[PDB]
Design a protein around this ligand. Structure first.
Ligand code: JRC
Ligand code: CL
Ligand code: MG
Ligand code: ZN
Length: 313
């Protein structure tokens, strides 16, 4: 109980910033995550023995894929940690608990393929969950790990608090389905502008938490340029493997997934920053002003991709 996690001074300072990179030392990521739960939530909110056992079961259930891996899980949780810490009073004790866990678990047992590829392959998961296929699986896996003996980090919550947290986590994980992000952000844009946004309206909280999840999930675009650029290699390694599998089914994949159209990556990054990332962090900054450093970092990286196109790198 009087056992803090401490980090070396550089990490202790930099972990508080939106652009923190969790480093190449895998064995420190669990400690980094417990550090964030302790500072974000209290040293009390989970029994260490149970938390540490949930963390290692979650790690074990991420696969060795280029991008949708254990590093991604902890990176996304850290972004959520930065948002919660910069918006201290806006969130309930239960939301802070559930959202860090939601982020850690949001891509559990990802195989490196899109919902589209599951459906065209006719994977069993596409029969079981007709929309947000992988995201319903991720939530299902989360619940299965919570039910292993010694793994219920939420044991000390009341029955109603327990149903509340698992409902926060389910919505948070489903919101990471980027097909749902576009409509969710439009509605938030409309509600912010017409001044109808009400953080006491549960369905309004839900939409805002959904935009936070999209923001945390896309956070490679808010890092220092070299992190952003090297993460993009990992993203394309999955995209192009999926394209290869599309060609095996006799289907010409979208250019995003076609390693033959590697040349046009820079222009594809502009499209993504303009269509997805910039609007996402803009609406998030409007709703939560202290998350502006994500929008500012995203704009800097857009400007770096523009320089790649102009042959300056
Ligand atoms: C939703 C999935 C799950 C994994 C993250 N994700 C993302 O979308 C995602 C998350 N972070 N980042 C940086 C991306 C990303 O790079 N996204 C995109 C989006 C559209 N594109 C089109 C083209 C293109 C390339 C060559 C030629 C022509 C086009 N490249 C892209 C890249
Ligand atoms: Cl604090
Ligand atoms: Mg996902
Ligand atoms: Zn993700």
């Amino acid at each position: 109980g009087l056992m803090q996690f401490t980090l070396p001074v550089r990490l202790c300072k930099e972990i508080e910033l939106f652009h923190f990179d969790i480093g190449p030392f895998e064995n420190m990521w669990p400690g980094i995550f417990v550090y964030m739960v302790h500072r974000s939530c209290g040293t009390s909110c989970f029994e260490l023995e149970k938390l540490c056992r949930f963390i290692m079961s979650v790690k074990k259930n991420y696969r060795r894929v280029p991008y949708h891996n254990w590093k991604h899980a902890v990176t996304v949780a850290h972004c959520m940690y930065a948002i919660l810490q910069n918006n201290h009073t806006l969130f309930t004790d239960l939301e802070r608990k559930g959202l860090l866990i939601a982020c850690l678990c949001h891509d559990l047992d990802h195989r490196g393929f899109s919902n589209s590829y599951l459906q065209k392959f006719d994977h069993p998961l596409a029969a079981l969950y007709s929309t947000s296929t992988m995201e319903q699986h991720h939530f299902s896996q989360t619940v299965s790990i919570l039910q292993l003996e010694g793994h219920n980090i939420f044991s000390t919550l009341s029955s109603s608090e327990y149903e509340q947290v698992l409902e926060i986590i389910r919505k948070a994980i489903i919101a990471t389905d980027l097909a749902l992000y576009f409509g969710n952000r439009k509605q938030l844009e409309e509600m912010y502008q017409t001044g109808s946004l009400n953080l006491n309206n549960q369905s309004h909280r839900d939409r805002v938490i959904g935009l936070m999840m999209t923001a945390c999930d896309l956070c490679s675009v808010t890092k220092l340029w070299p992190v952003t650029k090297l993460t993009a290699n990992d993203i394309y390694a999955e995209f192009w493997a999926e394209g290869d599998e599309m060609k095996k089914l006799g289907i010409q994949p979208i250019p995003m997934m076609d390693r033959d159209k590697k040349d046009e990556v820079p222009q594809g990054q502009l499209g993504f920053y303009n269509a997805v990332a910039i609007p996402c962090y803009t609406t998030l900054t409007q709703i939560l002003p202290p998350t502006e450093p994500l929008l500012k970092a995203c704009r800097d990286n857009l400007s770096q991709w523009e320089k790649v196109i102009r042959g300056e790198e």
